[PDB]
């Protein structure tokens, strides 16, 4: 019997993504090697029909999304394809072509769902992971593309009424957008656009008074700090900043993380002039 | 008497940068307004002769740097000019032109200085701040420029034998270079480049076990963590990671900073395969 090397085996699975009779198992095997194979993304991108096969997997479940009928097995399979897209989103050789093909858009219907069943939560979290890995690269062109889409209202809806984990990733995505100069100007260009962000941030602080989440509070504070770099937003935050960020509500929680304290201390200092 | 509005006052000082008789005082007044006037950078950049006058201030002290004869008065004046260049380096309207003019290169003679006197430390720290603000914008064009210069050995020198605060900012600059995909591959494509970085980082851990610095340890671990994303570096760090990063040497101080613990623990897990 022949014992293929590992590179040959990966290419075999990639080739097996073309045909529907072998695709589900190939998706499973490749998704497991996502961490072990550093060049997996260009291997996927430059393979004929492969990216098209993965997008077909995504779109195949669109009819199960609205009305919500998605099964655990359908979510399982499509999230394997999504894990391969996250690999392509985060690799320097494929990231830019990934954006040029507008691939993140195919995940947005998944971000609109509100069903709390495990198949939908698993799909939503996996989709947020693709977008989160995309903005973590700190590339200006990522933010430019996202600003042409509805990503900000999508994140805000999840920040307000998602699971704590979904909220943390949605806030991180908003945080990366705000950290970009164009993104900060975008959100602050209209007082109504800014007001929507601030209202939703303010309500998250009220929840954080009841559910002390260190990871969520860190990114909420960071979004407030970056907003304080815009003069129009900085004047409004002097009045609409929740009182829980001024007293000692999160004092005992923040004593464990000095990085967030300095941010909150630099935030209140930027609101005094 | 006429009460001149603030925008015209700022422009008066900007115009006074063009004459030697008034430049010093204008430098002082403008540097004090750096954080109050959000559009100071394009005002400086689009004013005739202003940038050329700031570069003349910098270049005017090149003969005082080697041999070291820089006075406190000279250092104070040029650091006011550097403070204005720092806000040009970080503004979205001017940063690209700042890079295309290759302005950061004018600061590198100051990073070669080794005098531990107050005029030289103040100049070195201020210069590091300009570069730190420039890389903090998380953009690829910044890192591309820096890689055509000798910024990396300059940072490594400072990380090895600079003051505690100088080490922190130089490590942060190296951190931002490592976080860029091109920067990581640049430092890791040659084993000589990687080992030089690893040797410097290894030595800083030893000093941190003697003189603890929470902020400096944070950025050292981040550099180790980002290096682990490169295969050739991960397998090498499996053997050359300092023992103080594997036991409870820093666990006493890390209990006050949860962010750094999540980084260090994530790093060793990648080294355990």
């Amino acid at each position: 019997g022949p014992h293929m090397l590992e590179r040959e085996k990966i290419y075999q699975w990639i080739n097996e993504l073309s045909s529907p009779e072998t695709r589900e198992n190939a998706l499973l095997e490749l998704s497991k090697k996502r961490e072990s194979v550093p060049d997996l993304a260009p291997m996927l991108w430059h393979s004929f029909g492969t990216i098209a096969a993965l997008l077909q997997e995504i779109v195949n479940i669109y009819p199960s999304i609205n009305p919500p009928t998605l099964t655990a097995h359908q979510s399982n399979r499509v999230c394997n394809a999504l894990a391969l897209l996250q690999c392509v989103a985060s690799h320097p050789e494929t990231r830019s072509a990934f954006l040029a093909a507008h691939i993140p858009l195919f995940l947005y219907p998944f971000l609109h769902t509100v069903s709390k069943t495990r198949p939908f939560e698993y799909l939503r979290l996996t989709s947020l992971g693709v977008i989160g890995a995309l903005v973590k690269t700190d590339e200006q062109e990522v933010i430019n593309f996202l600003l042409t889409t509805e990503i900000i209202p999508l994140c805000l809806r999840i920040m307000e009424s998602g699971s704590e984990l979904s909220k943390t990733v949605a806030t991180f995505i908003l945080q990366k957008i705000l950290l970009d100069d164009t993104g900060l100007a975008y959100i602050c260009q209209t007082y109504e656009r800014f007001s929507h962000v601030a209202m939703i941030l303010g309500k998250m602080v009220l929840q954080l008074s009841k559910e002390p989440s260190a990871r969520l509070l860190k990114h909420v504070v960071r979004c407030y700090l970056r907003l304080s770099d815009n003069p129009r937003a900085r004047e409004a935050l002097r009045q609409c900043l929740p009182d829980q960020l001024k007293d000692t509500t999160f004092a005992q929680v923040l004593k464990d993380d000095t990085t967030t304290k300095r941010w909150l201390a630099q935030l209140v200092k930027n609101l005094q002039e | 008497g006429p009460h001149m509005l603030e925008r015209e006052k700022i422009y008066q000082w900007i115009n006074e940068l063009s004459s030697p008789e008034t430049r010093e005082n204008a430098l002082l007044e403008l540097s004090k307004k750096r954080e109050s006037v959000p559009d100071l950078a394009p005002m400086l950049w689009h004013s005739f002769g202003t940038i050329a006058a700031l570069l003349q201030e910098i270049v005017n002290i090149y003969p005082s740097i080697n041999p070291p004869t820089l006075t406190a008065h000279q250092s104070n004046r040029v650091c006011n000019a550097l403070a204005l260049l720092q806000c040009v380096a970080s503004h979205p309207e001017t940063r690209s032109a700042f890079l295309a003019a290759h302005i950061p290169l004018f600061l590198y003679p100051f990073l070669h200085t080794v005098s531990k006197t107050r005029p030289f430390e103040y100049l070195r720290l201020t210069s590091l701040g300009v570069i730190g603000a420039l890389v903090k914008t998380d953009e690829q064009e910044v890192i591309n420029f820096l890689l055509t210069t000798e910024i990396i050995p300059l940072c490594l020198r400072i990380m090895e034998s600079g003051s505690e605060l100088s080490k922190t900012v130089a490590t942060f600059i190296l951190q931002k270079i490592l976080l860029d995909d091109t920067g990581l591959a640049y430092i890791c494509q040659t084993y000589e480049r990687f080992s030089h970085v690893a040797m410097i980082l290894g030595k800083m851990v030893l000093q941190l076990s003697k003189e603890p610095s929470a902020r400096l340890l944070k950025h050292v671990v981040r550099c180790y963590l980002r290096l682990s994303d490169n295969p050739r570096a991960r397998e090498a760090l499996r053997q050359c990671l300092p023992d103080q990063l594997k036991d409870t040497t820093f666990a006493q101080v890390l209990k006050d900073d949860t962010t750094t613990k999540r980084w260090l623990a994530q790093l060793v897990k990648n080294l355990q395969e």
Partner: peptide, 21 residues
């Protein structure tokens, strides 16, 4: 099974935590 088990759910959580932190 081919469904969603605790291992898959926990591995996703660790993936997301490493992305945002």
């Amino acid at each position: 099974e081919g469904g969603i088990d605790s291992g898959m759910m926990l591995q996703l959580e660790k993936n997301l935590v490493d992305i945002v932190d």
